[PDB]
């Protein structure tokens, strides 16, 4: 009995959960159309020449 009735420790536990996210985007595009004699040229990004 003296051993099973002793004081046991009391504790406080701290947990920290930390989460960080970052992003970065960068677009750039030229999209033209030229018309000289007889010719018709169109340059884009989706379709090419």
């Amino acid at each position: 009995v003296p051993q099973l009735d002793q004081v046991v420790p009391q504790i406080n536990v701290q947990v920290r959960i930390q989460e960080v996210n970052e992003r970065a985007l960068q677009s750039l595009g030229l999209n033209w159309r030229a018309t000289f004699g007889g010719f018709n040229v169109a340059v884009s990004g989706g379709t090419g020449l």
Partner: peptide, 29 residues
């Protein structure tokens, strides 16, 4: 037989109860 084992979760105590030979075997483990 085999020695009686008593486990207390609150105090983390192991209690072995048996013949003196059966108790010295747990004591060395």
């Amino acid at each position: 037989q085999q020695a009686t084992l008593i486990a207390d979760k609150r105090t983390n105590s192991l209690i072995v109860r048996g013949t003196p030979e059966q108790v010295a075997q747990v004591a060395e483990l």
